[PDB]
């Protein structure tokens, strides 16, 4: 939950230290919480990483609201620059 | 029957080899040999023929 959706790959090692729990047993716990329909995702052993397609939606407060404030201002700016690009491109092209 | 047993043997070799090579894009020839338990040299020659074919 702490990680964003853009980094739903996590090494098995970090999962171990956070869980203080062994590689075999960390993998066991992962496949269990993926099997129960609690989570959905993939796990890569070669580098030992966990590609979860597992993200939830609830439990957050005023600080996350302000963070979404910043993010929504950012994407309003992105939409603004896209619209301005369209509007600057139009005059030379709709007048023909 | 005997006069075509040879060709049937050959085609079975070919198609089993095709089965065997699918799980890879790179492979070691001796590994193919042990999988099919035929000598590495015959495997090399016959795969060379297959590529030529």
């Amino acid at each position: 939950f702490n990680r964003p959706a853009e980094d739903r790959t996590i090494p098995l090692k970090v999962i171990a230290e956070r869980t203080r729990l062994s590689i075999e047993d960390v993998e066991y716990l992962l496949m269990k919480s993926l099997s129960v329909h609690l989570i959905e995702g993939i796990i890569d052993q070669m580098e030992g990483t966990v590609h979860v397609s597992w993200v939830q939606p609830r439990v957050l407060g005023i600080p996350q609201i302000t963070s979404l404030r910043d993010r929504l201002d950012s994407w309003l700016g992105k939409v603004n620059t896209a619209l301005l690009s369209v509007e600057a491109e139009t005059p030379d092209l709709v007048a023909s | 029957i005997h006069r075509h047993l040879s060709s049937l043997y050959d085609t079975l070799l070919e198609q089993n080899l095709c089965r065997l090579i699918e799980p890879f894009s790179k492979v070691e020839i001796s590994h193919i040999a042990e999988l099919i338990e035929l000598p590495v040299d015959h495997v090399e020659r016959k795969l060379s023929q297959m590529i030529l074919d």
Partner: protein, 147 residues
């Protein structure tokens, strides 16, 4: 039937030890014994059951770790796989020189993309659901402020 329906990776020992006794009891029930080969043949379905879970929750598994997770040797663990690509039961590729089992079909760029826009088309729909969801509360809430 839950353990096989639910996509649980079943360790053979934990399931078998309990059900060795219940299996043996079926030798005395109507229909005769389940068969001597059944114990070894059942040994595959849990492998088949787990392996399907493996591929779905593992894409690139070390054959060692597969041999570990399949409670079996590398050659048997690989063999149980080799058959499954042979049987078409799963699409995978082993790299014996690396001992790497990749369960993912080689996706063509269009195969990559088809999912991508599908994700967005949901994102578009998702926001388009959140889209109407927001004014409605404004509509409902502002009415509550009208009293």
């Amino acid at each position: 039937l839950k353990q096989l329906v639910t996509m649980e990776v079943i360790l053979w020992t934990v399931l078998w030890n309990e059900f060795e006794s219940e299996f043996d009891n079926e030798k005395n029930l109507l229909g005769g014994p389940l068969g001597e080969k059944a114990g070894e043949d059942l040994k595959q379905r849990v492998i088949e059951h787990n392996i399907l879970v493996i591929s779905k929750y593992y894409s690139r598994i070390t054959l060692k770790r597969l041999s570990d997770l399949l409670c079996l040797s590398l050659q048997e663990a690989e063999k149980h796989l080799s058959d499954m690509v042979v049987s078409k039961a799963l699409i995978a590729k082993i790299d014996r020189p690396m001992g790497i089992v990749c369960f993912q079909v080689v996706k063509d760029s269009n195969d990559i993309l088809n999912s991508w826009s599908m994700n967005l088309e949901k994102l578009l729909d998702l926001v388009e659901k959140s889209c109407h969801q927001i004014h409605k509360e404004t509509m409902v809430h502002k009415a509550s402020l009208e009293v």
